[PDB]
Design a protein around this motif. Sequence first.
Motif, PDB file in Angstrom:
ATOM      1  N   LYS F  17      -7.547  10.495   0.427  1.00 22.84           N
ATOM      2  CA  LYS F  17      -6.513   9.609  -0.121  1.00 22.84           C
ATOM      3  C   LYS F  17      -5.962  10.281  -1.379  1.00 22.84           C
ATOM      4  N   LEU F  18      -4.634  10.353  -1.485  1.00 19.75           N
ATOM      5  CA  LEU F  18      -3.942  10.764  -2.706  1.00 19.75           C
ATOM      6  C   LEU F  18      -3.093   9.554  -3.043  1.00 19.75           C
ATOM      7  N   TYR F  19      -3.059   9.156  -4.295  1.00 19.10           N
ATOM      8  CA  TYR F  19      -2.582   7.795  -4.478  1.00 19.10           C
ATOM      9  C   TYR F  19      -1.069   7.770  -4.628  1.00 19.10           C
ATOM     10  N   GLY F  22       0.864   3.671  -4.699  1.00 18.06           N
ATOM     11  CA  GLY F  22       0.716   2.641  -5.716  1.00 18.06           C
ATOM     12  C   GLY F  22      -0.108   1.441  -5.270  1.00 18.06           C
ATOM     13  N   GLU F  23       0.566   0.376  -4.825  1.00 20.61           N
ATOM     14  CA  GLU F  23      -0.159  -0.803  -4.347  1.00 20.61           C
ATOM     15  C   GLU F  23      -0.938  -0.544  -3.026  1.00 20.61           C
ATOM     16  N   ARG F  24      -0.218  -0.431  -1.899  1.00 19.86           N
ATOM     17  CA  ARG F  24      -0.812  -0.288  -0.551  1.00 19.86           C
ATOM     18  C   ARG F  24      -1.914   0.756  -0.459  1.00 19.86           C
ATOM     19  N   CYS F  25      -1.943   1.628  -1.464  1.00 24.71           N
ATOM     20  CA  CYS F  25      -2.981   2.654  -1.661  1.00 24.71           C
ATOM     21  C   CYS F  25      -4.408   2.098  -1.767  1.00 24.71           C
ATOM     22  N   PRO F  28      -6.736  -2.234   2.639  1.00 21.64           N
ATOM     23  CA  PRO F  28      -7.261  -1.660   3.899  1.00 21.64           C
ATOM     24  C   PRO F  28      -6.138  -1.406   4.928  1.00 21.64           C
ATOM     25  N   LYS F  29      -4.904  -1.591   4.469  1.00 22.57           N
ATOM     26  CA  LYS F  29      -3.744  -1.254   5.280  1.00 22.57           C
ATOM     27  C   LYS F  29      -3.316   0.203   5.009  1.00 22.57           C
ATOM     28  N   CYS F  30      -3.911   0.816   3.971  1.00 25.48           N
ATOM     29  CA  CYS F  30      -3.831   2.267   3.721  1.00 25.48           C
ATOM     30  C   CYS F  30      -4.084   3.066   5.002  1.00 25.48           C
ATOM     31  N   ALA F  31      -3.311   4.141   5.167  1.00 26.32           N
ATOM     32  CA  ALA F  31      -3.391   4.932   6.389  1.00 26.32           C
ATOM     33  C   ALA F  31      -4.730   5.657   6.483  1.00 26.32           C
ATOM     34  N   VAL F 111       3.801   2.286 -10.294  1.00 26.81           N
ATOM     35  CA  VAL F 111       2.717   2.185  -9.312  1.00 26.81           C
ATOM     36  C   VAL F 111       2.469   3.559  -8.626  1.00 26.81           C
ATOM     37  N   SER F 112       3.533   4.365  -8.559  1.00 23.83           N
ATOM     38  CA  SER F 112       3.529   5.705  -7.966  1.00 23.83           C
ATOM     39  C   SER F 112       4.367   6.604  -8.854  1.00 23.83           C
ATOM     40  N   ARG F 113       3.996   7.894  -8.929  1.00 28.09           N
ATOM     41  CA  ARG F 113       4.756   8.902  -9.694  1.00 28.09           C
ATOM     42  C   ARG F 113       6.119   8.981  -9.034  1.00 28.09           C
ATOM     43  N   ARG F 114       6.085   8.860  -7.718  1.00 26.71           N
ATOM     44  CA  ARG F 114       7.284   8.743  -6.924  1.00 26.71           C
ATOM     45  C   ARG F 114       8.194   7.590  -7.457  1.00 26.71           C
ATOM     46  N   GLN F 115       7.595   6.526  -8.000  1.00 25.85           N
ATOM     47  CA  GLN F 115       8.354   5.478  -8.686  1.00 25.85           C
ATOM     48  C   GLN F 115       8.573   5.841 -10.143  1.00 25.85           C
TER      49      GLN F 115
END
Lengths: 96, 122, 99, 137, 82, 208
Positions: F17-19, F22-25, F28-31, F111-115
């Motif tokens: 897992k790489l976060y 943010g949230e969904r990370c 248990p719906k995480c991939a 929540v994400s660096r992407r954000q």
Amino acid sequence: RNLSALKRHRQSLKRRLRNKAKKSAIKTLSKKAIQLAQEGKAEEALKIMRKAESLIDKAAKGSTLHKNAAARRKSRLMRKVRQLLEAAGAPLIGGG
Amino acid sequence: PTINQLVRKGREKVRKKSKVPALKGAPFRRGVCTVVRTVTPKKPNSALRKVAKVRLTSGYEVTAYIPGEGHNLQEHSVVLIRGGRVKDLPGVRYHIVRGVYDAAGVKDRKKSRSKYGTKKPK
Amino acid sequence: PKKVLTGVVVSDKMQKTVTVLVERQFPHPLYGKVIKRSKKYLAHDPEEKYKLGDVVEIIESRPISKRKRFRVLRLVESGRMDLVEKYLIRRQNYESLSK
Amino acid sequence: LTDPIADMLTRIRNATRVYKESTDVPASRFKEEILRILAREGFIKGYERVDVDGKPYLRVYLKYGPRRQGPDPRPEQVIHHIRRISKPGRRVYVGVKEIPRVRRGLGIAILSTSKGVLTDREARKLGVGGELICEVW
Amino acid sequence: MVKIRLARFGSKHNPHYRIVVTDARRKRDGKYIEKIGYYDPRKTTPDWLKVDVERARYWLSVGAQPTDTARRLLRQAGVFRQ
Amino acid sequence: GRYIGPVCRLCRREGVKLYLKGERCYSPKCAMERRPYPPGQHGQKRARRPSDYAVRLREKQKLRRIYGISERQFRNLFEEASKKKGVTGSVFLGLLESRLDNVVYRLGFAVSRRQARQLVRHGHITVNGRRVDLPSYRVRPGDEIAVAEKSRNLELIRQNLEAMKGRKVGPWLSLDVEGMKGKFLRLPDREDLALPVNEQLVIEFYSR
RNA sequence: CCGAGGGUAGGGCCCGUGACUGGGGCGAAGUCGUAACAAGGUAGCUGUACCGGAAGGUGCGGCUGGAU
RNA sequence: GCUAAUCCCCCAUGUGGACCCGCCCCUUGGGGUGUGUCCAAAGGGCUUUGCCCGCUUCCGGAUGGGCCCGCGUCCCAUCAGCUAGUUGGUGGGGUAAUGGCCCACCAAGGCGACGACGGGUAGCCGGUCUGAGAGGAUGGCCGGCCACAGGGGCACUGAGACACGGGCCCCACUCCUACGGGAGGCAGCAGUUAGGAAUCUUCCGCAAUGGGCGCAAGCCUGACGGAGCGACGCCGCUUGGAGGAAGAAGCCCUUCGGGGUGUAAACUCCUGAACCCGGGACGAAACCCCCGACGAGGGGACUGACGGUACCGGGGUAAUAGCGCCGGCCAACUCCGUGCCAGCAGCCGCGGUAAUACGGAGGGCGCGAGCGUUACCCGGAUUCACUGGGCGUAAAGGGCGUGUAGGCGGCCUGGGGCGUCCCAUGUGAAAGACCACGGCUCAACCGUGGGGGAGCGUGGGAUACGCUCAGGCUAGACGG
Ligand code: SF4
Ligand SMILES: [Mg+2]
Ligand SMILES: [Mg+2]
Ligand SMILES: [Mg+2]
Ligand SMILES: [Mg+2]
Ligand SMILES: [Mg+2]
Ligand SMILES: [Mg+2]
Ligand SMILES: [Mg+2]
Ligand SMILES: [Mg+2]
Ligand SMILES: [Mg+2]
Ligand SMILES: [Mg+2]
Ligand SMILES: [Mg+2]
Ligand SMILES: [Mg+2]
Ligand SMILES: [Mg+2]
Ligand SMILES: [Mg+2]
Ligand SMILES: [Mg+2]
Ligand SMILES: [Mg+2]
Ligand SMILES: [Mg+2]
Ligand SMILES: [Mg+2]
Ligand SMILES: [Mg+2]
Ligand SMILES: [Mg+2]
Ligand SMILES: [Mg+2]
Ligand SMILES: [Mg+2]
Ligand SMILES: [Mg+2]
Ligand SMILES: [Mg+2]
Ligand SMILES: [Mg+2]
Ligand SMILES: [Mg+2]
Ligand SMILES: [Mg+2]
Ligand SMILES: [Mg+2]
Ligand SMILES: [Mg+2]
Ligand SMILES: [Mg+2]
Ligand SMILES: [Mg+2]
Ligand SMILES: [Mg+2]
Ligand SMILES: [Mg+2]
Ligand SMILES: [Mg+2]
Ligand SMILES: [Mg+2]
Ligand SMILES: [Mg+2]
Ligand SMILES: [Mg+2]
Ligand SMILES: [Mg+2]
Ligand SMILES: [Mg+2]
Ligand SMILES: [Mg+2]
Ligand SMILES: [Mg+2]
Ligand SMILES: [Mg+2]
Ligand SMILES: [Mg+2]
Ligand SMILES: [Mg+2]
Ligand SMILES: [Mg+2]
Ligand SMILES: [Mg+2]
Ligand SMILES: [Mg+2]
Ligand SMILES: [Mg+2]
Ligand SMILES: [Mg+2]
Ligand SMILES: [Mg+2]
Ligand SMILES: [Mg+2]
Ligand SMILES: [Mg+2]
Ligand SMILES: [Mg+2]
Ligand SMILES: [Mg+2]
Ligand SMILES: [Mg+2]
Ligand SMILES: [Mg+2]
Ligand SMILES: [Mg+2]
Ligand SMILES: [Mg+2]
Ligand SMILES: [Mg+2]
Ligand SMILES: [Mg+2]
Ligand SMILES: [Mg+2]
Ligand SMILES: [Mg+2]
Ligand SMILES: [Mg+2]
Ligand SMILES: [Mg+2]
Ligand SMILES: [Mg+2]
Ligand SMILES: [Mg+2]
Ligand SMILES: [Mg+2]
Ligand SMILES: [Mg+2]
Ligand SMILES: [Mg+2]
Ligand SMILES: [Mg+2]
Ligand SMILES: [Mg+2]
Ligand SMILES: [Mg+2]
Ligand SMILES: [Mg+2]
Ligand SMILES: [Mg+2]
Ligand SMILES: [Mg+2]
Ligand SMILES: [Mg+2]
Ligand SMILES: [Mg+2]
Ligand SMILES: [Mg+2]
Ligand SMILES: [Mg+2]
Ligand SMILES: [Mg+2]
Ligand SMILES: [Mg+2]
Ligand SMILES: [Mg+2]
Ligand SMILES: [Mg+2]
Ligand SMILES: [Mg+2]
Ligand SMILES: [Mg+2]
Ligand SMILES: [Mg+2]
Ligand SMILES: [Mg+2]
Ligand SMILES: [Mg+2]
Ligand SMILES: [Mg+2]
Ligand SMILES: [Mg+2]
Ligand SMILES: [Mg+2]
Ligand SMILES: [Mg+2]
Ligand SMILES: [Mg+2]
Ligand SMILES: [Mg+2]
């Protein structure tokens, strides 16, 4: 098709005349005196030799002769005349 | 060699021999095709490889490969060439660039398309 | 300063001029070893006092002739005909390097 | 004989390799000074000016390590490695800033300087360079 | 004459001069005789002017000729104060 | 620009897992939680031994994929580190860290660096007052990183500011909620971060 | 006087090209034999010389990098 | 044919300056002195018995140059001999000046395996690129020097040119014409054409920096400052973010149970490139004008190509992705089609009916306004090896002596100090690179400071080793 460079060529032609004319004379005289000094004829050599020297320095006033040329022409003029009169002497005027 | 010998004779920098002379120091060179035909490869391969003899702006006349499936090159076809031999067709040392001058791109390439001068499809 | 060099006279056969051979050492710029290289200078001798075999010093000078830009500075040693041999024999070998 | 120095070092290297207690090398006020460094730094037990058939030598007393375990009990060397640097074929001279660090400090470079024969370490200390005679470890 | 003037360094829409002594016949950004200070016309730093004053006075004594817009930056550092 | 596509396949290929969301990370719906095996047709096939080259590629890509950064930008930093005093591995991570968009996400504003990029890029973030919309600004010690005044009143930053009230932030950083402003205290010692990365293997990648 | 160059004449070096010709590389789907590798079916290789469709052969001398 | 002047000339004047001879100091023609001789000048303007700008001769500074010398500067020895202004001398010519730079005479010299002569190739450097370094390669942009200005020769003018947009002549080419006769030289900026794989706008402005002329206002400046085109390079930024199914359709695989694409999509919500609206620079404070003294000093004002552009503010749309690869080297695997064909290919090699290697497809890996190919440079190549290789059989000992040059050389003592080593000092431009910091929101780019260096000159020192000279020795060598 135009320019005042034309002007500047127009002028050079005229300065060229005045120059050449001046230099001609110096050689005519120097040689004249050197000729005299050979068969010396001392008073006359010296007489013409002065007329040379005058004309040389006169040329060095302007663009004709750089000062060192005048110096040099004078130096060689004098040396020749003197050493020529050594084959008979003696210096009738000045000089010196 | 001794050190003295090396002072005397030095070492020799070895020069490189170009493998694409006809290029005359150019990245590419333009030409015209004289003969456009097929050639048979050496052992252990077997095929009918497509080749053009090309006459250059650089004075030289060379055989160059025609890559792709099918082509439109014939006599008088103007062509740009690049370097690169085809190991199995001796004497061929250059490639025709598809997509340039009278050398058409490949009809219906989908993969590796830039190497074949085939435009992008709808 | 005016560059000063020391060497053997190998020729006196010009009038008022000697050929002075100056020698030097330096490490090979790549192979390190110390190597000799030599060079002939035409040196001015107004006095024709310098003889074959003299070891002399010459000083860079205002140009005297084409090729002569050195006057002789002074005597150092006399009678080094052994040096003159080394040179002369070397030139004589050249007759044997041709075709 | 063309290199008295190289000869000495080799007389040593050769003897140390079959484990002689000593070996004789033809004498010289320069070779000694080198031995003076070899001993001081503990590469040799030392040397003494002897005589063989009326002729001066330097007898050189060689030093090794403990007997060893395994099939080859031959002790380790104290002089593992000694080699000419400068040579007659090519004189090698360093200035002070370019004196080498032998074996990362654990070895020495003897050099000849106009302040006598020194090690790398000593040369740096008096701050002079010179002909790099050799290297030992 | 030898001159005191402004050689433009820096870059586009970003001037940075070196007040410098050079022969008048040089090109602007060419080999200069001696550097004697600098000048940021956009004033973007605390010292957008520096001038060795002790030096500029020498060259003037010896015949250097400053430009107009250099004469000033010599006034502003009071090379001229009597 | 940067990667901008399906981001769960990244984690699955990396075997970790790489976060990156943010949230969904954390759900248990995480991939990685459902399929902890590599994307695509052969993900469940038995992996065969990765080569050394293979290994160091992944460790490099993993570190890179974490920061959403382009391969060049990654390189240029690393090279910078190789010229810079100290242990390159440390300094590299340090410099990767001093990126504005990373700083922002570390101080929790996103929540994400992407954000955290789109925030910086849309100018909602600032430094020492002045606005900065450059995801690559190299942040130094002493800097005040605040939310924009005109952005303080925004749904999303509010929601996100509300989430940080007592969660502690790394030893190299201080955070003042309500004030919407954080502060860059020093460059991270390596211990100060615990990324799933043997950073040594990264150096080893770039020495081939 | 010297002098750009022009003209006359004879040389030197280099590039391109040429009826025809000499071998060379390659290709391979042929013809002829089988010289070398095994004592390769005459041990081989060799400098030279003469000779033969061809590999080759023989003479003289040499080498073993020759089997038994 | 006439007329002016800072045009030209003539005499006067001589601080000075020039030249010959003697003399003193020096020491290549440097400085001073005595006699002899010779050389100066141009005035204009205002506020007008006083300024300003000019004019003259001399000295010294500064700056830019000329010439000279040591060392360095590529390939071929299948180029080994080259040289008659040749090498030196004497006198003279010439120049600012030395010099066979030019001439006359005299002498017979000069150069060359340390590579002359000849052929080929190249403008050189700061630097650049690579490389652990040593080295290799390179000289584009920027700075330094050189050389050239259609191809040649020439001098004039001048402080300076043997003058790119000055002159003369010869050649080649083109054009003009009224057919008699004339013209031109973009290797200045743009632009056309040819050639080529290929390389820009016939833009804007003197606002800034700089240059020329001018007391100054100011005029000119394709230098330059900027704008235009081109993904050519580097740097920055975007095509969104969060949430969202045990997970639709489509497509691919399948042992038909299911697995993949894929949180990917849809969809929900948050932001808000573009775009609208308003405002809007830094770059520019001098010159001039003011009072003071036309100085020092303090205030007046003018001026912006870029540009209404950057940027600041307010509003505001979910808004371009492509390219290479997936046999091994090398990160990425399955289905179909084909069947030694069509084709791939950098090397090894794939294809002859179950091809991870061809073509398509699904999927995957790698990078991303880029990706890839071709060309070339260094690297890997210790594969020219100084660092750092080798030669019985792998490529490599000369067929063997004798011996020239050269390279190299035993023990001991001194002298010298050439190599060598150390200290000082000058030089080692600027930019670039390296470390620090700082300005453009970052960076790229750019600025300020710092650190040095090799290498050459100078001064002082050391003397082990190499050198050199000098004196001893007997172990090498030679002789009896
Ligand atoms: S959910 Fe968060 S962690 Fe799990 S895969 Fe997607 S990003 Fe990686
Ligand atoms: Mg006029
Ligand atoms: Mg007459
Ligand atoms: Mg005059
Ligand atoms: Mg004149
Ligand atoms: Mg085959
Ligand atoms: Mg054509
Ligand atoms: Mg392919
Ligand atoms: Mg003479
Ligand atoms: Mg060595
Ligand atoms: Mg980019
Ligand atoms: Mg490992
Ligand atoms: Mg480091
Ligand atoms: Mg993490
Ligand atoms: Mg984490
Ligand atoms: Mg590397
Ligand atoms: Mg003639
Ligand atoms: Mg002729
Ligand atoms: Mg003619
Ligand atoms: Mg033929
Ligand atoms: Mg034939
Ligand atoms: Mg036989
Ligand atoms: Mg047989
Ligand atoms: Mg047989
Ligand atoms: Mg025979
Ligand atoms: Mg027959
Ligand atoms: Mg027979
Ligand atoms: Mg025999
Ligand atoms: Mg009148
Ligand atoms: Mg008078
Ligand atoms: Mg003659
Ligand atoms: Mg003379
Ligand atoms: Mg002149
Ligand atoms: Mg001559
Ligand atoms: Mg020589
Ligand atoms: Mg040679
Ligand atoms: Mg030529
Ligand atoms: Mg050329
Ligand atoms: Mg290397
Ligand atoms: Mg070059
Ligand atoms: Mg170039
Ligand atoms: Mg240049
Ligand atoms: Mg010419
Ligand atoms: Mg010409
Ligand atoms: Mg032309
Ligand atoms: Mg002409
Ligand atoms: Mg002109
Ligand atoms: Mg001309
Ligand atoms: Mg010229
Ligand atoms: Mg010019
Ligand atoms: Mg022109
Ligand atoms: Mg008419
Ligand atoms: Mg006419
Ligand atoms: Mg015209
Ligand atoms: Mg064309
Ligand atoms: Mg053009
Ligand atoms: Mg341009
Ligand atoms: Mg202007
Ligand atoms: Mg101006
Ligand atoms: Mg003026
Ligand atoms: Mg204009
Ligand atoms: Mg399911
Ligand atoms: Mg599923
Ligand atoms: Mg589905
Ligand atoms: Mg399904
Ligand atoms: Mg999404
Ligand atoms: Mg302004
Ligand atoms: Mg690829
Ligand atoms: Mg790779
Ligand atoms: Mg693999
Ligand atoms: Mg078919
Ligand atoms: Mg199949
Ligand atoms: Mg492949
Ligand atoms: Mg395939
Ligand atoms: Mg490697
Ligand atoms: Mg190499
Ligand atoms: Mg290579
Ligand atoms: Mg070696
Ligand atoms: Mg080898
Ligand atoms: Mg052999
Ligand atoms: Mg032999
Ligand atoms: Mg022979
Ligand atoms: Mg000898
Ligand atoms: Mg000797
Ligand atoms: Mg000795
Ligand atoms: Mg001695
Ligand atoms: Mg010395
Ligand atoms: Mg120094
Ligand atoms: Mg510098
Ligand atoms: Mg900053
Ligand atoms: Mg700097
Ligand atoms: Mg350095
Ligand atoms: Mg001594
Ligand atoms: Mg002796
Ligand atoms: Mg004996």
